[PDB]
DNA sequence: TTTCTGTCTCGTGCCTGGTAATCC
RNA sequence: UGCCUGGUGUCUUGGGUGU
DNA sequence: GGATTACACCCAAGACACCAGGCACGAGACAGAAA
């Protein structure tokens, strides 16, 4: 699908650590994936992500949500979680952090959910 | 014989594969093919193979020497004496065989080494035996004025360099052709350089690193055939200026030698290469001498 | 390429063999193209493996 | 501590010169690059050292020796701490104070925080 | 001294391509690089910049009726066998037929006369290495099931011996990972092993 | 050179009004001289200045 | 006035150093 | 067969946004 | 006397070794001078 079509991927990482960029590859269809390689796929549904608002006064200001991809350019929250974040929709902004490992994903889904 | 290292390392592409299973090779024929024996010895020194020398009639010699040594008695005492003599003789043969094998091996090694030494001597002599190019209407041994044109590789962005040297062996003028070699401008500029400046080179040398130089050679030959660039003869079928390829081992080594850099501190590497080609045409012997130690690395 | 070791001065060496990827091409026994840096294993012999450093002929 | 902190090591007799990674240069425009503050301070220290060495071997008026050695002491001190209360700070040609190594480590924008 | 030596076609070829005439001739296999694909021919380039071409009769197998472009594309290097060499013009013709690219194995002309060559030793080593190639590795199978037990035939029978008639045990089969042996107690000191063939297996250890 | 596209520039290095532009496109083309290297060895005028 | 030229002025170039609380 | 590019100042200051 | 005084984010705008003076290489013009 490539790096412009959702769902897609951005890079393919070999065992030795070399990165294959899928934007500048003319033979993307001529790539066979071996076990143990890594594919830097796009963010998809039900991916745990850490979500945060400043100032972080207490530990409920950082909680892990499940991703749902939607149109338009704003983060969207169920309104019950606007209390722990001390957030309202008059212009506030919030930070999203993506875990990059299986261990970190498990920690987010089992501790900060 | 083959060791386990020999059993595994002698591949169908390796040079040692020629004798992986040789047997009963005559010694007398080895001297005519020294490289085979040298390569066998080299493989042996690598711990791969084992060279064995054996005689088909060894039993004949053993029996003859026993018959000379053995007694003619028939009594059981004489039988015991003959048995003791034969056993001691067999032990003596066992001790003696390796020394004789080593002596024969060393003799054949020396013979093959001397043969290959003479062969290399003849090859080098043939390599370095060539008088300078003789221009027409001149006696042999006359040093000709030469012009060298080269561009090296021919990739997009490869200008053609020209270096002219007179019979004196001193550089007279170097020129750059910055247009495409297939354009009319290149041919016109080369013709102007050849004719107007009174350069009048006796022979033109062309060389390069790849097949792209062939197209330049063809283009130059066509230009010479078209413009009738005959050699100037000092005072009448005027002869054309010859265009040939030039061997360039000495030129390649000269373009990297610091001797050229000291001689020409403000010149490009391709200019040094062209100068080396021109000097080789003028005098191959002196160029081969200029290699000093790197001459030993030439493919002789 | 023969498998031997030599010692030579830097001057004696001709030049580096600059080869483009269009020139430095390797094909395995099965015919699949193998490029620079890939890991292959010897089919027979010691059956060793390693990363390709340079390809020539 | 005899092994690690010997009292006479508190007096500097040889100065370690940090690698350029610690004091990287910046290209102000497309042509002229700018030397770092630490590089200029080290140049000043080295000039003072050269001056002391030259003065010592040639001729020794004690007043001149005191002046030049006090200048060297000032440069070395301000190279590591430019907020010494009770004396003027070292200034750049632009008039701004020199960013000593101590200033690199303190504050919200320092190394630690 | 002899007059200046003029290079000939072989010498010019060796000088330019840095490839000897012996190492580049008829009956040799080289990994050429495809540079242009056409219906009636394919233009390819060798390692030494020698441009080559193959007529349509040889890019594809004589039995196949596909198109040259569909099977081979630009940038897809393939093995080729040299048919003809134009040394003067640095042009060569190649063949992709497997009768050349594959059957040509003992390309050396080493004299294999039995008087001076030990053919028997080389043959024996050849079956030795071929048997080494035939040699492979195998491992055990692990299955998660309440009535599955990793036991031998006699082991399963002894395990069922302490159990009453009708109890069932499951063990791996000797016919392969796609087969399963089920042992059940027919009678006191009487057991039946039944082989079960597995189809549509997700994995060797899977059911 | 920048990774954008220079194809929207005119002869004088300036884009013309009415042209649709996207991110990272080059709207002003400017070059600064650099002392040439030894590329004059065998480059056919195709050396970076 | 014709012709060879001198020799010092001068353009182009460059080195390198002078120059606001509070609190303990 | 003519063949394709990732590399981005620093230091101050000022005005703003959300608590 | 010393040390420290919430968190995060955005944008724009103005400054960043200059210089001058003494030492060298090359050149050239307008005037000397023989004929
Ligand atoms: Mg708000």
Commentary on this structure:
This is part of a larger assembly, with two copies of chain A (113 residues), two copies of chain B, one copy of chain C (57 residues) and one copy of chain F (49 residues). With 113 residues, chain A is mostly beta strands. Helices cover 9% and strands 22% of the residues of chain A. Chain A contains one helix and six strands. In chain A, a hairpin with a 5-residue loop joins strand 1 and strand 2. In chain A, 3% of the residues are buried. With 300 residues, chain B is α/β, with parallel strands linked by helices. Chain C contains no helices and four strands. In chain C, the strands form two sheets. A two-stranded antiparallel sheet of chain C has the order 1-2. A two-stranded antiparallel sheet of chain C has the order 3-4. The radius of gyration of chain C is 14 Å and the shape is flat. Chain F is elongated and about 45 Å long. The structure holds magnesium ion.
Please describe the biggest sheet of chain F, giving its number of strands, its sense, and whether it closes into a barrel.
Answer: none
Work out the helix count of chain F. Answer: 0
Binned, the helix content of chain F reads under 10%
Q: Percent of residues of chain F in beta strands?
A: under 5%
Count of alpha/pi helices of chain C = 0
Biggest interface: B-E, 30 and 26 residues
Shape of chain F: elongated
Measured distance between first and last alpha carbons of chain F: 13 Å
Rg of chain C (C-alpha, Å):
14 Å
Subcellular location (chain C): Nucleus
Family (chain C): Belongs to the SPT5 family.
Protein name (chain C): Transcription elongation factor SPT5
Organism (chain C): Komagataella phaffii (strain GS115 / ATCC 20864) (Yeast)
């Amino acid at each position: 699908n490539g790096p412009n079509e959702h769902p897609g991927a951005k890079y393919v990482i070999r065992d030795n650590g070399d990165r294959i960029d899928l934007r500048y590859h003319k033979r993307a269809g001529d790539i066979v994936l071996q076990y143990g390689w890594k594919v830097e796929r796009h963010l998809m549904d039900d991916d745990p992500v850490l979500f945060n608002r400043q100032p972080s006064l207490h530990k409920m200001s950082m909680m892990a949500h499940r991703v749902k991809v939607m149109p338009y350019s704003t983060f969207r929250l169920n309104l019950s979680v606007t209390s722990p974040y001390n957030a309202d929709f008059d212009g506030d902004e919030m930070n999203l952090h993506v875990p990059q490992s299986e261990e970190t994903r498990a920690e987010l889904s089992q501790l900060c959910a | 014989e083959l060791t386990e290292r020999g059993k595994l390392q002698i591949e169908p592409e390796s040079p040692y594969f020629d004798f992986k299973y040789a047997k009963n090779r005559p010694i007398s024929a080895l001297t005519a093919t020294p490289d085979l024996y040298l390569r066998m010895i080299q493989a042996e020194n690598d711990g791969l193979v084992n060279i064995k020398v054996e005689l088909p009639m060894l039993s004949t010699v053993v029996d003859h020497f026993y018959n000379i040594l053995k007694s003619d008695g028939t009594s059981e005492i004489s039988e015991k004496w003959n048995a003791l003599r034969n056993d001691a003789w067999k032990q003596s043969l066992d001790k003696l065989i390796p020394l004789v094998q080593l002596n024969v091996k060393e003799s054949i090694r020396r013979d093959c080494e001397r043969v290959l030494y003479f062969q290399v001597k003849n090859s080098f002599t043939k390599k370095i035996d060539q008088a300078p190019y003789q221009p027409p209407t001149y006696a042999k041994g006359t040093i000709p004025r030469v012009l060298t044109l080269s561009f090296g590789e021919g990739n997009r962005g490869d200008a053609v360099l020209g270096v002219f040297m007179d019979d004196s062996g001193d550089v007279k003028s170097q020129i750059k052709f910055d247009e495409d070699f297939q354009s009319r401008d290149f041919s016109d500029s080369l013709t102007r350089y050849i004719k107007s400046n009174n350069i009048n080179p006796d022979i033109i040398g062309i060389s390069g690193f790849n097949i792209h130089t062939k197209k330049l050679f063809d283009k130059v030959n066509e230009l010479v055939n078209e413009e009738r660039l005959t050699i100037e003869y000092d005072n009448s079928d005027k002869h054309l200026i010859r265009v040939i390829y030039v061997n360039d081992e000495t030129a390649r080594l000269y373009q990297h030698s610091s001797k050229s850099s000291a001689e020409y501190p403000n010149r490009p590497q391709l200019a040094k290469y062209c100068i080396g080609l021109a000097k080789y045409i003028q005098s191959p012997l002196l160029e081969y001498l200029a290699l000093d130690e790197s001459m030993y690395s030439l493919h002789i | 390429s023969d498998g031997k070791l030599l010692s030579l001065p830097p001057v004696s060496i001709y030049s580096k063999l600059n080869l483009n990827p269009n020139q430095q091409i390797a094909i395995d026994s099965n015919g699949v193209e193998v490029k620079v840096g890939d890991t292959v294993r010897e089919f027979t012999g010691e059956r060793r493996q390693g990363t390709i450093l340079h390809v020539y002929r | 501590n005899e092994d690690y902190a010997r009292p006479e090591w508190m007096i500097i007799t040889v100065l370690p010169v940090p690698p350029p990674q610690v004091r990287p240069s910046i290209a102000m425009d497309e042509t002229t690059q700018g030397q770092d503050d630490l590089t200029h301070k080290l140049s000043d220290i080295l000039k003072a050292n050269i001056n002391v060495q030259k003065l010592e071997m040639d001729g020794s008026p004690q007043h001149i020796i005191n002046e030049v050695e006090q200048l060297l002491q000032f440069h070395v001190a301000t190279y590591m701490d430019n907020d010494i209360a009770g004396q003027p700070q070292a200034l750049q040609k632009s008039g701004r104070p020199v960013k000593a190594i101590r200033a690199r480590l303190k504050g919200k924008e320092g190394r630690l925080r | 001294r002899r007059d200046f030596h003029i290079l000939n076609e072989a010498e010019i070829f060796q000088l330019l391509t840095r490839e000897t005439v012996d190492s580049f001739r008829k009956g040799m296999v080289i990994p050429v690089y495809v540079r242009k694909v056409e219906s009636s021919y394919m233009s390819v380039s060798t390692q030494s910049l020698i441009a080559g071409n193959i007529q349509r009769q040889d890019i594809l197998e004589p039995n196949d009726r596909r198109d040259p472009r569909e099977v081979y594309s630009v940038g897809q290097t393939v093995r080729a066998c040299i048919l003809d060499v134009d040394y003067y013009n640095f042009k060569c013709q190649l063949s992709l037929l497997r009768q050349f690219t594959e059957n040509q194995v003992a390309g050396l002309n080493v004299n294999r006369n039995p008087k001076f060559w030990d053919i028997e030793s080389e043959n024996r080593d050849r079956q030795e290495e071929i048997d080494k190639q035939r040699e492979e590795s195998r491992e055990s199978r692990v299955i998660k099931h309440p009535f599955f037990h990793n036991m031998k035939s006699k082991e399963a029978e002894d395990y069922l011996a302490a159990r009453p008639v009708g109890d069932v045990v499951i063990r791996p089969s000797s016919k392969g990972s796609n087969h399963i042996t089920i042992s059940w107690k027919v009678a006191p000191q009487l057991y039946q092993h039944i082989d079960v063939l597995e189809e549509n297996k997700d994995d060797a250890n899977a059911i | 050179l920048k990774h954008g596209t220079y194809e929207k520039l005119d002869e004088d290095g300036l884009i013309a009004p009415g042209v649709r532009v996207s991110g990272d496109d080059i709207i002003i083309g400017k070059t600064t001289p650099i002392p040439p290297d030894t590329e004059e060895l065998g480059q056919r005028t195709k050396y970076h200045t």
